[PDB]
Design an enzyme around this catalytic site. Structure first.
Site, short mmCIF file in Angstrom:
data_model
loop_
_atom_site.label_atom_id
_atom_site.label_comp_id
_atom_site.label_asym_id
_atom_site.label_seq_id
_atom_site.Cartn_x
_atom_site.Cartn_y
_atom_site.Cartn_z
N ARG A 12 -15.78 17.63 -20.99
CA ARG A 12 -16.86 18.61 -21.29
C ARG A 12 -17.81 18.02 -22.31
O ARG A 12 -17.51 17.04 -23.00
CB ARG A 12 -16.25 19.88 -21.88
CG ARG A 12 -15.20 20.54 -21.02
CD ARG A 12 -14.72 21.82 -21.66
NE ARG A 12 -15.70 22.91 -21.66
CZ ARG A 12 -16.36 23.36 -22.72
NH1 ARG A 12 -16.22 22.77 -23.89
NH2 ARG A 12 -17.18 24.39 -22.61
N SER A 32 -18.39 34.23 -20.78
CA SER A 32 -18.73 34.67 -19.40
C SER A 32 -17.80 35.82 -18.98
O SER A 32 -18.28 36.78 -18.35
CB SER A 32 -18.66 33.53 -18.42
OG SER A 32 -17.40 32.87 -18.51
N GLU A 61 -28.64 25.38 -19.09
CA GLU A 61 -28.07 26.34 -18.12
C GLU A 61 -27.56 27.58 -18.87
O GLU A 61 -27.75 28.70 -18.38
CB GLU A 61 -26.90 25.72 -17.34
CG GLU A 61 -27.27 24.58 -16.40
CD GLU A 61 -26.09 23.91 -15.69
OE1 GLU A 61 -26.31 22.91 -14.97
OE2 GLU A 61 -24.95 24.41 -15.84
O1 I7P Z 1 -11.11 31.58 -19.25
P1 I7P Z 1 -12.20 31.55 -18.09
O2 I7P Z 1 -11.55 31.19 -16.71
O3 I7P Z 1 -13.18 32.67 -18.09
O4 I7P Z 1 -13.15 30.27 -18.37
C1 I7P Z 1 -13.13 29.48 -19.53
C2 I7P Z 1 -12.74 28.03 -19.17
O5 I7P Z 1 -11.41 27.96 -18.64
P2 I7P Z 1 -10.28 27.05 -19.31
O6 I7P Z 1 -10.05 27.68 -20.72
O7 I7P Z 1 -9.15 27.16 -18.36
O8 I7P Z 1 -10.91 25.59 -19.36
C3 I7P Z 1 -13.76 27.50 -18.15
O9 I7P Z 1 -13.36 26.20 -17.69
P3 I7P Z 1 -12.78 25.92 -16.22
O10 I7P Z 1 -11.44 26.76 -16.14
O11 I7P Z 1 -13.93 26.39 -15.38
O12 I7P Z 1 -12.56 24.39 -16.15
C4 I7P Z 1 -15.10 27.37 -18.92
O13 I7P Z 1 -16.08 26.61 -18.17
P4 I7P Z 1 -16.75 25.35 -18.89
O14 I7P Z 1 -15.71 24.36 -19.26
O15 I7P Z 1 -17.70 25.74 -20.02
O16 I7P Z 1 -17.59 24.77 -17.63
P5 I7P Z 1 -19.02 25.12 -16.95
O17 I7P Z 1 -18.76 26.18 -15.91
O18 I7P Z 1 -19.99 25.54 -18.14
O19 I7P Z 1 -19.33 23.66 -16.44
C5 I7P Z 1 -15.55 28.79 -19.25
O20 I7P Z 1 -16.84 28.82 -19.92
P6 I7P Z 1 -18.19 29.37 -19.33
O21 I7P Z 1 -19.02 28.20 -18.90
O22 I7P Z 1 -18.68 30.05 -20.61
O23 I7P Z 1 -17.87 30.30 -18.15
C6 I7P Z 1 -14.51 29.47 -20.17
O24 I7P Z 1 -14.92 30.82 -20.47
P7 I7P Z 1 -15.50 31.30 -21.87
O25 I7P Z 1 -15.31 30.13 -22.84
O26 I7P Z 1 -14.71 32.59 -22.22
O27 I7P Z 1 -16.96 31.62 -21.60
MG MG Z 2 -19.56 26.52 -19.95
MG MG Z 3 -21.96 26.01 -17.74
MG MG Z 4 -21.09 23.25 -15.51
#
Ligand code: I7P
Ligand code: MG
Ligand code: MG
Ligand code: MG
Ligand code: CL
Ligand code: CL
Length: 134
Positions: A12, A32, A61
């Site tokens: 990340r 989110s 974004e």
């Molecule tokens: O708990 P969850 O399922 O709601 O999502 C978590 C996190 O899950 P994890 O803890 O298992 O890694 C997500 O990672 P993944 O599971 O998608 O790999 C992450 O996306 P990210 O890395 O930023 O990636 P991008 O989509 O920005 O590229 C997301 O951030 P948001 O972008 O803001 O949605 C987080 O939500 P929160 O921090 O509450 O907002």
């Molecule tokens: Mg994110």
């Molecule tokens: Mg994002």
């Molecule tokens: Mg992304």
């Protein structure tokens, strides 16, 4: 497409989006899944994507801002969630009214004094609070 380090940690990038070169106020965005919580904007690096490029893309974004990319602060792990984040300074020079996450999920953004950013990140995002330690 999610990408990973050799130890299986998700890759990340994120920016500390400061109002000015004084680095006194930073832009946080809403979670989110839990919009009453604040986070540092950031997300997954794409295949072959430079971390500085991913950081700037993700801030655009998620927070709808652009500006002057500054230094790498450091590389920070979340052991529980198994991800490793490159964290950069960005000095915001452009604030866009409509941005991808505002349109798509109603993501919010707000300026915080550094001490208040640390306070609201501590409970759910203590590693993101630790981005500001230095
Ligand atoms: O708990 P969850 O399922 O709601 O999502 C978590 C996190 O899950 P994890 O803890 O298992 O890694 C997500 O990672 P993944 O599971 O998608 O790999 C992450 O996306 P990210 O890395 O930023 O990636 P991008 O989509 O920005 O590229 C997301 O951030 P948001 O972008 O803001 O949605 C987080 O939500 P929160 O921090 O509450 O907002
Ligand atoms: Mg994110
Ligand atoms: Mg994002
Ligand atoms: Mg992304
Ligand atoms: Cl500032
Ligand atoms: Cl984290």
């Amino acid at each position: 497409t999610r990408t990973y380090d050799g130890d299986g940690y998700k890759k990340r990038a994120a920016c500390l989006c400061f109002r000015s070169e004084s680095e006194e106020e930073v832009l946080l965005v809403s979670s989110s899944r839990h919009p009453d919580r604040w986070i540092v904007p950031g997300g997954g690096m794409e295949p072959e994507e430079e971390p500085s490029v991913a950081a700037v893309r993700e801030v655009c974004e998620e927070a709808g801002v652009k500006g002057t990319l500054g230094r790498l602060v450091g590389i920070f792990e979340n052991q529980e969630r198994k991800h490793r984040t490159y964290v950069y300074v960005l000095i915001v020079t452009e604030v866009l009214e409509d941005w991808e996450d505002s349109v798509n999920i109603g993501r919010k953004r707000e300026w915080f004094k550094i001490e208040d950013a640390i306070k609201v990140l501590q409970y759910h995002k203590p590693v993101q609070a630790s981005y500001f330690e230095t």
